[PDB]
C-alpha cells in the first residue's frame, strides 16, 4: 500500500515511523534538499544512499545494526517547489514506487544499481519519505519542516542532511553514525569530494579543478582542526548530522525565529542573522546552558559532489558562502561570553574560548583579504620592476591598469549589472587574473633564484605532508594549483561580488528594503575604507602627500615604504601560522583516531 | 453646453476648433503637462495664462489680435494618469466648469484673479481643453497625443508647451507669439524665473537660491547665444513654442518612433535616443531637407517656475537633465553632416556647422567636469598646503579623505541605494562640499592677496555686465554664488548620480534590460577611465611609478607636476572663453533687438 499526506499548517503547528505497531526508532534521518536538480543529480544521492543501507544490513557483529538494519533508517526527500521541479526525476521516483506541503511515504523493495551517462537501471528495502512543497521558499523553510515537524513525530536519535546531487560513499553514512556512540558528541559530518568526471575529464574545466583543490584541502585541514577543539564552524549542508536531543529547544528556536528579544525597530543581529544559515545551530548547540556538547568530523565517510563548471553560476554560488561565513563568525564571536555560561568542564570551556577566538581571527583575515591581495600583487610587481626593471615596469603599470580596470569593472558590474549577462567579460577577467598569477609566480621564482622562498616551501610542504597524511594527495598534481590560477579570482572577483551584494535586494517590505539597502551600502563603504586605511598606511590617499608637506614645513615622495615589507612578511608569517595550526589539528586528529582504533 | 470625448486609439489613428461653422485657427496651442501637481501648482499656470489672454483681447492696433483675440487661442490641459491625480485640482477645474484618453472642452467665462496661500477666487472667455489620460505613460506619450493628434485636427500655426506649476508672465505668451511673424523662424521659448517666495523667503532654502542663479544666468546667457546662431539646444519644456509646419513630417516621426532604419539587434543611437527628449525636435527641424528654419529665444516673455527645495528630489530631477543633454548633444553632433544637406543658405549652413561644433565642445567639457573639479580642488588645496603649510596640509588630507569618502559613498549609494532613503547623509555631503567650496575660495583669496585673479575677476565682471545688460542683476546679490556653495554638489553629486544611473533600470523586456545594463555599466567605466586618464596624465595610476622606474633604469617621485598648472590655466582660459562667447552672444542679441525695435 502507498499512502500520501498533504500538510496545510506550518511545521510548528504540525510520520509513518510513529504510525506503527512497534514505535520505530529514527536512529538516523537523511534530509534530501532538491530545488530543480537534474534527474541524474537527485538520482546520484539516492543511488549513493542505497549502497549505504546495503552495507548496514549485511553486517553481522553489531548490537544496533544487522539483517534488520533497514527498519531504523528513514530517508526524507524534501523537494522545494513543484512548479520548478523537473518531471524527469519525478518519473525516476515513480519507477521506484515513490511518486502547504505534500508527503509521500513508500517502501521500495527495488534498488537502482546502474547509472550510465543517461540511463538508470532498476532491479528487484528502503523507507522513503518524499516531501513535496507547494510554493518555493528558502531552504531554511525546508529545514523548518525537517526539525519543527517530522523530528518530533519520529523522535530521531540523529538527523542527517543531504543535497540532491551528492554521492554518499560506498560506506559513508554508517561511518557517520559511528561517531555518536560517544555520548558527548552533538554533531558530525562527512568529507566532500568533487566529481572530476569519468577518467578525471571535468579536471579540464579549470574551475572544476579549482573547486577540487578547494574542497579536498578544506576537508583535509579545516574540518579536522575545528573538530579537535569541539566546535566545527559549518556542518556542510551537503552531508552533515546533528543529534536531535542536542539541537532540541533553544538552538532550533534561535535558528528559526531569529533573536527573540526585539523591538519594532531593527538592530544589527536580530535583523541580519539570515546571512549565516545552518551556522547558528553549531553555536547554539555547543554553548548550550548546562550541557557539554561536542562537534566532530568523520573522516571515514565521504561524499562526492557536483560542481558548477562555468564562471557566472560559480560566482552566484560562492556569494552565499562568503556572506554566510562573515555574518556567522561575527555573531558567534560577539557572543563568545556565553561559552562560559554553559555546562562544559573548565578545560572544555577554555578550549572553546580559544577556538572561537581562532575563528574570529580567521574571519578578520578574510575581511582584509582584498587589500592583502592588492598589496601582495602590487608590491610583488613593483619589486621585480624595481630590480629586474626591463619589461616588468611597463608590465607593472599594464597589470596595475589591468587590475584597476578589472576591479573597477567588478564593482560596477556587481553593483549595477548581473553576472549571467556579462559572461565573456568575466571569462576575460578570470584569464587576466590568471595571467597575473602566472606573472606573480614568475616574479617569485625569478627573484628567489637570483637572490619568502623559505615560507613558500614550508607552506607547500605542510600542505603535502598533511595531504598525504590524509591519504588523498593525488589532487596536489590533479592540476590543483596549476588550475588554482582561479585563486586570484577567488580573492577579488568573489569577495567584491559578495560584499557588494550583501543582502540580495529586490526593490513593512519597503522599510525593510530601505534599511537593508542602507546596511548593505554601509558595510560596503566600511569594507572599502578599512581596506584602504590598510592600503594607505602603501601610503596612498594623500598620506604620502601629508608626510611630504610636513617635511617641507621645516622635498619629494619615495616609491617604496618598509610598511609594505612589514605587511609583506607579516602576511606570509600569518598564513604560515594558519597552515601550521591546521596541520597540527589534522595530525592530532589522525593520531587520536589511529590510537583509538 | 459642456461636451466630453473618450479617445480609444493611439494619436496616429486619432478637436472642437475644427468642429465649428467657421474653421477656427489655432494661432497658438498651449500644452499643460500635469502628472500629480498640487492644486496651487497647476492653478498657477492657468492663472498666469488667463492674464495673457486678457492682454491679447484688450489690444487695439493689431491685424491678428483684438476684441476677438480670445477665439484664436486653445489651451489644452494634458493630464498624465487619473489615478495619481489630486482631486483638489480637479475640484478647482470643476469650479471653472471644465471638469485610451478623456477629452474635456469647455468655454470658461469666469476668471481666477486671486490666489492666496491656500484660497483661489473665481469671479464673473477661455477655450479650455482638458485632456485626461487613462494610465500613466511617459511625457513623450503626452507629446505624441499633442502632435500626432490634436495638431492635425486643429492645424496650429504655433504650438506652445507649458508645465502645470509654471507662471506665464503678465504679458509673456503674446511676446512669444510675436516671434513667428518672421517667416524663417521655427521655434521660440520664454525665459524661466524661479519662485523665490513672498518677500524672497524661499531664497532661504540654499537650494532654491542655487537653482535661482542657475536659471537666471542660463536664460541670460545660453538661450541668447544659441538663438543668435539659429539652433537652440533645448526649447525648455516649461515654456516653449514650435511652428507646426516646421516640425511637421520628418522631425515628428524621428522624435516619436525612433530612428526608423533598424534591425532586430540594438545599435547605439536607434536604441539610446530616449535619453534626449524634446531635444531631437530642434535638430530634425533646423537641419531639415530643403528648408531654412531658425530657432529664436524671446526675452520679453517670462515664466516663473516652482523648484524642489530638498536635496533628494533635486538630485532625482537633475539626473534626467544631465542624461538628456549628453545623449542629445552626442547624437546631434555625430549627425552634423546633414546640416549641409538642408535648404539653408551658405551663410546659414556655415553658422549652423559652427554652432553644432560649439555645442559638442560644451558637452565635451561637461563630460570631463568630474575630473576637472577633482583636479581644481586637489591642486588648489595642495597649492596652499605647499605654500601656506600650517593647518592646510592636515586640512588637505582631511578634505581629500572627506572628498574620497563622500565620492566613493556617492558611487556606492547611486549604484546600490536610493536618494530618498539616505537623506541626512546627502545633506551632510552637500554641507561637506559647501565647506570645501568655502575652503577653496579662502585659498583663492589668501594666495591671491599674498602674491587666476585676473581670470576670476574677468569672468565675474562678464557675468555682471551681461546680467545688468539683461536688466536682471539683483539675483547676483540674492545670495546667488553665496548660495552657489551647492555648485560643488552640482559638479560631483549630480554627475555621479547621473551617469551611474544612465538608463534607470527596473529588473523582449529581459534582453532589453540586459543590453541597457551593459551599456550603462560600460558608459560608467568609460566615464571613470577617461576622466582618470586625464587625472593620471596628476600622474596617478602608476604613471609616476613608471617614470620613476625608467629613471632608475639608467630616484624618487615629485609631488607636483606642471601638467596640473597647464591643466589648471587651460581650464580657466577655457571657461573664460565660454563666458566670453556667451556674453558676446547676449550682447549681439540685445543690440539686434534694440536696433530692430
Ligand atoms: C588604478 C588605475 C585604474 C583606473 C580605473 C578607475 C579609476 C578609479 C579611481 C581611483 C584610482 C586611483 C589610482 C591609484 O593611485 O592607484 C594607486 C593606489 O592603488 C589603489 O588605490 C588600488 C585601487 C584599485 C583601483 C581602484 C578602482 C576600484 C574602485 C574601488 C576599489 C577599492 C580599493 C580597495 C583595495 C585597494 C596605485 O598604488 P601606488 O602607485 O603604488 O601608490 C603608492 C603611493 N606612493 C607612490 C606615494 C608611494
Ligand atoms: C582618496 C581616499 C578615499 C578612500 C575611500 C575609498 C578608497 C578608493 C580606492 C582608490 C583610492 C585611491 C587613493 C589615491 O591615491 O588618491 C590619489 C589620486 O586621486 C584620485 O585618484 C581621486 C579618486 C577619488 C577617490 C576614489 C573613490 C571613488 C572611486 C571612483 C572614483 C572615480 C575617479 C574619477 C575622478 C578622479 C590622490 O591624488 P594625489 O595624492 O595628489 O596623487 C599624486 C600622485 N603623485 C603623488 C605620485 C604625484
Ligand atoms: O535557493 C536555494 C538554495 C539551495 N537549495 C537547495 O540546496 C541545494 C544546494 O544547491 P546547489 O548545490 O545547486 O548550489 P548551492 O545552493 O549549494 O550553492 C539545492 O540542490 C536545493 O536542494 C534550494 O532549494 N534553494
Ligand atoms: O515622469 C514625468 C516627468 C514629467 N511629467 C510632466 O512634466 C512636468 C515636469 O515635472 P516636474 O516639474 O515636477 O519635474 P521635472 O520632471 O521637470 O524634473 C510634470 O509636472 C508633469 O506634467 C510627467 O508627467 N511625468
Ligand atoms: C564557510 C564555508 O565555506 N562553508 C561551506 C558551506 O557553506 C557549504 O555548504 C559546504 C559544502 O556545500 O562547504 C562549506 O565549506
Ligand atoms: C540642457 C538643459 O539643462 N535643459 C533644461 C531642460 O531639460 C529643462 O526642461 C528646462 C526647464 O525645465 O531648462 C533647460 O535648461
Ligand atoms: Mg542542486
Ligand atoms: Mg549542488
Ligand atoms: Mg510638476
Ligand atoms: Mg515642476
PDB file of C-alpha atoms in Angstrom, chain A residues 378 381-383 385-386 389-390 393-394 396-397 400-401 405 408-409 411-413 415-418 421-422 425 505 507 510 513-514 517-518 520-522 524-525 528-529 532-533 536 540-543 545-546 548-550 552-553 555-559, chain B residues 378 381-383 385-386 389-390 393-394 396-397 400-401 405 408-409 411-413 415-418 421-422 425 505 507 510 513-514 517-518 520-522 524-525 528-529 532-533 536 540-543 545-546 548-550 552-553 555-559:
ATOM      1  CA  UNK A 378      51.356  45.389  -6.254  1.00  0.00           C
ATOM      2  CA  UNK A 381      55.148  43.536  -9.241  1.00  0.00           C
ATOM      3  CA  UNK A 382      56.860  46.765  -8.187  1.00  0.00           C
ATOM      4  CA  UNK A 383      59.642  44.735  -6.554  1.00  0.00           C
ATOM      5  CA  UNK A 385      60.011  46.131 -11.705  1.00  0.00           C
ATOM      6  CA  UNK A 386      62.355  47.928  -9.249  1.00  0.00           C
ATOM      7  CA  UNK A 389      63.391  46.675 -14.492  1.00  0.00           C
ATOM      8  CA  UNK A 390      63.159  45.738 -18.215  1.00  0.00           C
ATOM      9  CA  UNK A 393      57.903  48.205 -15.288  1.00  0.00           C
ATOM     10  CA  UNK A 394      55.623  48.540 -18.377  1.00  0.00           C
ATOM     11  CA  UNK A 396      53.736  46.678 -13.780  1.00  0.00           C
ATOM     12  CA  UNK A 397      51.616  49.692 -14.917  1.00  0.00           C
ATOM     13  CA  UNK A 400      48.150  47.674 -12.431  1.00  0.00           C
ATOM     14  CA  UNK A 401      45.976  49.319 -15.064  1.00  0.00           C
ATOM     15  CA  UNK A 405      40.071  48.294 -14.875  1.00  0.00           C
ATOM     16  CA  UNK A 408      36.518  48.876 -11.025  1.00  0.00           C
ATOM     17  CA  UNK A 409      34.532  46.949 -13.623  1.00  0.00           C
ATOM     18  CA  UNK A 411      32.444  46.849  -8.579  1.00  0.00           C
ATOM     19  CA  UNK A 412      30.359  48.445 -11.314  1.00  0.00           C
ATOM     20  CA  UNK A 413      29.101  45.124 -12.703  1.00  0.00           C
ATOM     21  CA  UNK A 415      26.549  46.884  -8.054  1.00  0.00           C
ATOM     22  CA  UNK A 416      24.651  47.623 -11.254  1.00  0.00           C
ATOM     23  CA  UNK A 417      24.797  44.569 -13.517  1.00  0.00           C
ATOM     24  CA  UNK A 418      24.293  40.809 -13.246  1.00  0.00           C
ATOM     25  CA  UNK A 421      24.521  38.970 -18.736  1.00  0.00           C
ATOM     26  CA  UNK A 422      28.262  39.715 -18.996  1.00  0.00           C
ATOM     27  CA  UNK A 425      33.937  39.745 -19.739  1.00  0.00           C
ATOM     28  CA  UNK A 505      17.889  43.278  -2.664  1.00  0.00           C
ATOM     29  CA  UNK A 507      13.203  46.667  -4.748  1.00  0.00           C
ATOM     30  CA  UNK A 510       9.617  48.853   1.678  1.00  0.00           C
ATOM     31  CA  UNK A 513      14.328  47.099   1.801  1.00  0.00           C
ATOM     32  CA  UNK A 514      15.434  50.627   2.665  1.00  0.00           C
ATOM     33  CA  UNK A 517      19.989  48.914   1.398  1.00  0.00           C
ATOM     34  CA  UNK A 518      21.493  51.246   3.987  1.00  0.00           C
ATOM     35  CA  UNK A 520      24.470  46.940   2.557  1.00  0.00           C
ATOM     36  CA  UNK A 521      25.773  50.285   1.307  1.00  0.00           C
ATOM     37  CA  UNK A 522      27.352  50.900   4.714  1.00  0.00           C
ATOM     38  CA  UNK A 524      30.470  48.191   1.542  1.00  0.00           C
ATOM     39  CA  UNK A 525      31.936  51.570   2.474  1.00  0.00           C
ATOM     40  CA  UNK A 528      36.438  49.707   1.178  1.00  0.00           C
ATOM     41  CA  UNK A 529      37.593  52.326   3.690  1.00  0.00           C
ATOM     42  CA  UNK A 532      42.065  51.360   2.092  1.00  0.00           C
ATOM     43  CA  UNK A 533      43.269  52.511   5.508  1.00  0.00           C
ATOM     44  CA  UNK A 536      47.180  53.850   2.874  1.00  0.00           C
ATOM     45  CA  UNK A 540      48.099  56.187  -0.805  1.00  0.00           C
ATOM     46  CA  UNK A 541      45.260  58.640  -0.143  1.00  0.00           C
ATOM     47  CA  UNK A 542      47.341  61.752   0.350  1.00  0.00           C
ATOM     48  CA  UNK A 543      49.154  60.232   3.365  1.00  0.00           C
ATOM     49  CA  UNK A 545      51.419  63.970   0.390  1.00  0.00           C
ATOM     50  CA  UNK A 546      50.892  64.778   4.077  1.00  0.00           C
ATOM     51  CA  UNK A 548      55.987  65.278   2.256  1.00  0.00           C
ATOM     52  CA  UNK A 549      54.261  68.533   3.226  1.00  0.00           C
ATOM     53  CA  UNK A 550      55.343  68.147   6.858  1.00  0.00           C
ATOM     54  CA  UNK A 552      58.599  70.717   3.516  1.00  0.00           C
ATOM     55  CA  UNK A 553      57.444  72.753   6.527  1.00  0.00           C
ATOM     56  CA  UNK A 555      61.325  67.522  -0.704  1.00  0.00           C
ATOM     57  CA  UNK A 556      59.613  64.743  -2.648  1.00  0.00           C
ATOM     58  CA  UNK A 557      57.903  61.344  -2.056  1.00  0.00           C
ATOM     59  CA  UNK A 558      59.633  57.881  -2.005  1.00  0.00           C
ATOM     60  CA  UNK A 559      58.356  54.961  -4.184  1.00  0.00           C
TER      61      UNK A 559
ATOM     62  CA  UNK B 378      43.081  68.934  -5.286  1.00  0.00           C
ATOM     63  CA  UNK B 381      44.311  72.540  -1.790  1.00  0.00           C
ATOM     64  CA  UNK B 382      47.804  71.136  -2.328  1.00  0.00           C
ATOM     65  CA  UNK B 383      48.968  74.550  -3.560  1.00  0.00           C
ATOM     66  CA  UNK B 385      49.206  73.355   1.649  1.00  0.00           C
ATOM     67  CA  UNK B 386      52.546  73.553  -0.240  1.00  0.00           C
ATOM     68  CA  UNK B 389      51.638  74.841   5.020  1.00  0.00           C
ATOM     69  CA  UNK B 390      50.227  75.195   8.579  1.00  0.00           C
ATOM     70  CA  UNK B 393      48.242  70.200   4.918  1.00  0.00           C
ATOM     71  CA  UNK B 394      46.160  68.331   7.568  1.00  0.00           C
ATOM     72  CA  UNK B 396      44.373  68.916   2.605  1.00  0.00           C
ATOM     73  CA  UNK B 397      44.413  65.171   3.527  1.00  0.00           C
ATOM     74  CA  UNK B 400      40.950  64.768   0.349  1.00  0.00           C
ATOM     75  CA  UNK B 401      39.837  61.969   2.650  1.00  0.00           C
ATOM     76  CA  UNK B 405      34.716  59.133   1.352  1.00  0.00           C
ATOM     77  CA  UNK B 408      33.034  56.726  -3.024  1.00  0.00           C
ATOM     78  CA  UNK B 409      29.865  56.842  -0.941  1.00  0.00           C
ATOM     79  CA  UNK B 411      29.092  55.951  -6.273  1.00  0.00           C
ATOM     80  CA  UNK B 412      28.000  53.238  -3.860  1.00  0.00           C
ATOM     81  CA  UNK B 413      24.738  54.973  -2.918  1.00  0.00           C
ATOM     82  CA  UNK B 415      24.693  52.312  -7.833  1.00  0.00           C
ATOM     83  CA  UNK B 416      23.131  50.356  -4.982  1.00  0.00           C
ATOM     84  CA  UNK B 417      20.956  52.696  -2.917  1.00  0.00           C
ATOM     85  CA  UNK B 418      18.292  55.347  -3.499  1.00  0.00           C
ATOM     86  CA  UNK B 421      16.361  56.580   1.824  1.00  0.00           C
ATOM     87  CA  UNK B 422      19.640  58.291   2.789  1.00  0.00           C
ATOM     88  CA  UNK B 425      23.873  61.729   4.527  1.00  0.00           C
ATOM     89  CA  UNK B 505      16.782  50.128 -14.882  1.00  0.00           C
ATOM     90  CA  UNK B 507      14.922  44.443 -13.462  1.00  0.00           C
ATOM     91  CA  UNK B 510      14.660  40.923 -20.280  1.00  0.00           C
ATOM     92  CA  UNK B 513      17.205  45.218 -19.670  1.00  0.00           C
ATOM     93  CA  UNK B 514      20.388  43.192 -20.109  1.00  0.00           C
ATOM     94  CA  UNK B 517      22.590  47.270 -18.160  1.00  0.00           C
ATOM     95  CA  UNK B 518      25.643  46.537 -20.295  1.00  0.00           C
ATOM     96  CA  UNK B 520      25.006  51.660 -18.622  1.00  0.00           C
ATOM     97  CA  UNK B 521      27.853  49.766 -16.960  1.00  0.00           C
ATOM     98  CA  UNK B 522      30.044  50.477 -19.991  1.00  0.00           C
ATOM     99  CA  UNK B 524      30.194  54.324 -16.484  1.00  0.00           C
ATOM    100  CA  UNK B 525      33.573  52.643 -16.935  1.00  0.00           C
ATOM    101  CA  UNK B 528      35.639  56.803 -14.975  1.00  0.00           C
ATOM    102  CA  UNK B 529      38.586  55.623 -17.080  1.00  0.00           C
ATOM    103  CA  UNK B 532      41.130  59.044 -14.775  1.00  0.00           C
ATOM    104  CA  UNK B 533      43.369  59.105 -17.847  1.00  0.00           C
ATOM    105  CA  UNK B 536      46.727  60.305 -14.484  1.00  0.00           C
ATOM    106  CA  UNK B 540      48.226  58.808 -10.567  1.00  0.00           C
ATOM    107  CA  UNK B 541      47.686  55.174 -11.573  1.00  0.00           C
ATOM    108  CA  UNK B 542      51.291  54.053 -11.502  1.00  0.00           C
ATOM    109  CA  UNK B 543      52.271  56.557 -14.232  1.00  0.00           C
ATOM    110  CA  UNK B 545      55.794  54.839 -10.682  1.00  0.00           C
ATOM    111  CA  UNK B 546      56.539  54.115 -14.349  1.00  0.00           C
ATOM    112  CA  UNK B 548      60.429  56.757 -11.626  1.00  0.00           C
ATOM    113  CA  UNK B 549      61.292  53.202 -12.689  1.00  0.00           C
ATOM    114  CA  UNK B 550      62.522  54.403 -16.088  1.00  0.00           C
ATOM    115  CA  UNK B 552      66.017  54.190 -12.073  1.00  0.00           C
ATOM    116  CA  UNK B 553      66.922  52.073 -15.114  1.00  0.00           C
ATOM    117  CA  UNK B 555      65.384  58.110  -7.636  1.00  0.00           C
ATOM    118  CA  UNK B 556      62.010  59.105  -6.197  1.00  0.00           C
ATOM    119  CA  UNK B 557      58.703  60.748  -7.287  1.00  0.00           C
ATOM    120  CA  UNK B 558      57.894  64.534  -7.238  1.00  0.00           C
ATOM    121  CA  UNK B 559      54.727  65.894  -5.500  1.00  0.00           C
TER     122      UNK B 559
END
